[PDB]
């Protein structure tokens, strides 16, 4: 599924991401935009043998288990295959644990490259929330 900007902002607000651990809603919408382009099916294999899954590109080496990645830790204790639903529930629950580490949203490379430092609030502007 491919969310519309405002559609996801409302979904993420409902899923408790507005001001979660110091990160405003715009951060998450912007992150989804550049990590998966709002696509819940996004799947990208990496150089280190891992793969990023879902709307928020959760990594198989640290967060979810895909059973084919070297040195898997599965911190979110969930199969990567379970993070590809149209229902963002599972990716949000895992995203919250990820950002609860001292590294915060820096875990999301695209967010770090395209959102951090920008007017993230712009991503929720012009939306009914």
């Amino acid at each position, epitope marked *: 599924k491919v969310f519309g900007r405002c559609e996801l902002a409302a979904a993420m607000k409902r899923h*408790g991401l507005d001001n979660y651990r110091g990160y405003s809603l715009g951060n998450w919408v912007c992150a989804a935009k550049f990590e998966s382009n709002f696509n819940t099916q996004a799947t990208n294999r990496n150089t280190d043998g891992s793969t990023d899954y879902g709307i928020l590109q959760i990594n198989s080496r640290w967060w979810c288990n895909d059973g084919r990645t070297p040195g898997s830790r599965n911190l979110c*204790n969930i199969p990567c295959s379970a993070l590809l639903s149209s229902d963002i529930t599972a990716s949000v629950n895992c995203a919250k644990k990820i950002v609860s580490d*001292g590294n915060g949203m820096n875990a999301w490379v695209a967010w770090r490259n395209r959102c951090k430092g920008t007017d993230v609030q712009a991503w929720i502007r012009g939306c009914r929330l």
Partner: antibody
Amino acid sequence: DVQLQESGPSLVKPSQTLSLTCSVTGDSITSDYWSWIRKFPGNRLEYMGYVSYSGSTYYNPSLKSRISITRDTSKNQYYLDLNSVTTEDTATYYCANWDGDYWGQGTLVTVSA
Amino acid sequence: DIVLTQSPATLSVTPGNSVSLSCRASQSIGNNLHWYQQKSHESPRLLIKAASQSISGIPSRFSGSGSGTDFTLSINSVETEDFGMYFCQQSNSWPYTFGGGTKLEIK
């Protein structure tokens, strides 16, 4: 299955450092975030802090920077240090994983002269 | 810090009746509220996470609802084993905080 178990002295002196150990069985500590919570006499619960995978820590400001949470992978356990304790630190200490699915049995630590 | 208020702090009920416990936060916490049950002499037991998400192994009669600053833990047909303390905890902002707790007592 995963099991948590606190251990350490139950009686400590004022001004000393209170230290406890949480032994994790059933899985590796490298697969979760780990916290310490304590309950005071009166049904008052206080979240002390936790250590995440990167080793970064978050401590409750109420502890006034007297707390330290560390880990030891080879022993599959993590620890709690609370410096310069006072009778105000007497409570039941529990270790639990970050999301709260697993809790230790809790251990009463009394601070007395 | 975020202050969680659980009022009434004590609730008297007859087994079989349905009750709701309140937890209000001093500032919005989205859906980041967890409900715990703590029977005397025992470690807390997580009943509901993320305000309304069910937990495997927990009786079905327990459910949670709410968002923002007002949350509710609902018990459908209270059982004797349910008597005890119930605490809500927020994880939206650090430091994580607990409500003062609500004690479920028989009439």
